Amino acid sequence: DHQLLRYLLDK
Amino acid sequence: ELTPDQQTLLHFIMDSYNKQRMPQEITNKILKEEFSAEENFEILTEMATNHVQVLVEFTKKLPGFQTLDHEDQIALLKGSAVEAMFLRSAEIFNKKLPSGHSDLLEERIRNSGISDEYITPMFSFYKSIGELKMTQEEYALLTAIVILSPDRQYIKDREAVEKLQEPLLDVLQKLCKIHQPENPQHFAELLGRLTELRTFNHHHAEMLMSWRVNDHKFTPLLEEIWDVQ
Ligand SMILES: Cc1cccc(C)c1-c1noc(C(C)C)c1COc1ccc(-c2ccc3cc(C(=O)O)ncc3c2)cc1
């Protein structure tokens, strides 16, 4: 769950 | 008595506070576009999403943030999302930031489906916080503080968050004595707003509900950060 936030941190 | 250890910390923050930037082409749409209840909303939503990214780039660059637990990192971003946004928009109106277009941003907010019940206090807040005559440091430091508030819901390791906030709060009190010796209650005035911001978080849940029932698509990023089905 909550892909986009996780993605924004890792990017 | 600003120690060099702290003089460097603040400088890291204030550079980040100008480093993660909202594009001009996007914010120009506050001025450029037509002024209708439909358009006002579309615009405000566009501003918000773009800002949610800017806040994530900023939060990432906060000292000792990436060292935190991956699970808690979401719960903080999620909890301080609206409050950080409320704090930045307050800086728009108060300090009249050119790229923010205060007067026209205010026209859109005041005509975007939002109830008088939530408009009155929202702007009462802007007025009062304005009167604090707050500096870009005080704005930037509160932001870091609101993001790293340990007492957010669905957190596990609050002691590790407390360790990250304390450092900022110490530095802020120092600045309230340095630049505001006349009034020692100034550090308390800044902290008073942290509580005022919280009350708007409740207001915001109801605001989103009103838009939803009136068919107002948000964005996958906002819908995530705030939880919208
Ligand atoms: C209506 C409201 C009030 C307070 C808080 C919220 C989340 C809402 C609120 N609640 O919902 C919404 C949408 C979903 C309709 C909003 C609208 O929020 C925002 C958030 C940010 C900005 C904004 C505008 C200009 C900026 C310029 C610059 C720059 O020049 O550097 N930087 C950042 C900027 C950010 C505008 C509206």
Protein architecture, described:
The complex is a heterodimer of chains A (11) and B (229). Chain A has 11 residues and is an all-alpha fold. Chain A is built from 1 helix and no strands. Chain A has one helix spanning 3-10. The termini of chain A are far apart. In chain A, 0% of the residues are buried. Chain B has one domain: Retinoid X Receptor, CATH 1.10.565. In chain B, helix 5 (70-95) crosses helix 7 and helix 5 (70-95) runs antiparallel to helix 8. Chain B has 11 helices and no strands. Helices cover 72% and strands 0% of the residues of chain B. The radius of gyration of chain B is 18 Å and the shape is globular. Chain B is mainly α and 229 residues long. The interface between A and B is small, with 7 and 13 residues. Bound molecules: the ligand Cc1cccc(C)c1-c1noc(C(C)C)c1COc1ccc(-c2ccc3cc(C(=O)O)ncc3c2)cc1. Chain B: It is found in: Nucleus. Chain B: This is Bile acid receptor. Chain B: Residues 5-229 form the NR LBD domain. Chain B: Belongs to the nuclear hormone receptor family. NR1 subfamily. Chain A: This is Nuclear receptor coactivator.
- What is the terminal-to-terminal distance of chain B? 50 Å
- Write out the distinct hetero groups bound to the structure: the ligand Cc1cccc(C)c1-c1noc(C(C)C)c1COc1ccc(-c2ccc3cc(C(=O)O)ncc3c2)cc1
What fold name goes in the CATH topology slot of chain B? Retinoid X Receptor
Helix proportion range of chain B = over 70%
Main sheet makeup of chain A = none
The major sheet of chain B is characterized as: none
* % residues in beta strands of chain A: under 5%
Q: For the largest interface in this structure, which chains are involved and how many residues does each contribute? A: A-B, 7 and 13 residues
What is the second-level CATH architecture of chain B? Answer: Orthogonal Bundle
Rounded to an integer in angstroms, the radius of gyration calculated over CA atoms of chain B is 18 Å
Structural class by helix and strand composition of chain A: mainly alpha
Characterize the overall form of chain A. Answer: elongated
Please estimate the helix content of chain A. over 70%
Distance between the termini of chain A: 17 Å
Q: How would you name the oligomeric state of the polypeptide chains in this document?
A: heterodimer
